[PDB]
């Protein structure tokens, strides 16, 4: 319910008081909270997109890593065909990446590395990935 959505909001926004790079352990806490709230996945996606819109530039790569971790965990746990998160994140993905590329110069390579992993592993189709690579 909305208690699980609130708990996800709390877990993700707590990053703003932590120094990047963000730990594997913290990412697991955020990802477990996302999956706990999966019956309200639309709210989870909205919260992650809000984080990426609002956060300081140092937190753009952490925000992208949250998308990566959630989408991969969901595909792993539920199957590539049944995952709700990838398709939902795909709706506003252009706007999301326009925000991510406001990161500091030394972080752009980290965004391109994730897009190349998504392409190679079929997390999204090339029709989605290529324009995001072109944006870099």
């Amino acid at each position: 319910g909305m208690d699980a959505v609130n708990a996800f909001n709390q877990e993700l926004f707590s990053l703003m008081d932590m120094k990047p790079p963000i730990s594997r352990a913290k990412m697991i806490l955020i990802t477990k909270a996302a999956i706990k709230a999966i019956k309200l996945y639309k709210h989870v996606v909205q919260i992650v997109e809000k984080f990426i819109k609002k956060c300081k530039p140092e937190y753009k790569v952490p925000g992208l890593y949250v998308i990566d971790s959630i989408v991969r965990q969901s595909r792993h746990q539920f199957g590539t065909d049944k995952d709700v998160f990838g398709p939902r994140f795909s709706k506003n993905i252009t706007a999301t990446f326009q925000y991510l590329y406001l990161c500091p110069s030394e972080d752009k390579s980290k965004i391109v590395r994730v897009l190349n992993l998504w392409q190679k592993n079929g997390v999204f189709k090339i029709e989605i990935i290529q324009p995001l690579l072109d944006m870099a």
């Binding site: 790079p21 963000i22 730990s23 594997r24 352990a25 913290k26 990412m27 697991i28 990802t31 952490p62 890593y65 990566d68 971790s69 991969r72 965990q73 595909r75 792993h76 746990q77 590395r113 994730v114 992993l117």
Partner: peptide
Amino acid sequence: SPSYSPTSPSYSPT
């Protein structure tokens, strides 16, 4: 504490 890596495998529900 080790940093998140996008090549690290997903966890199994422990």
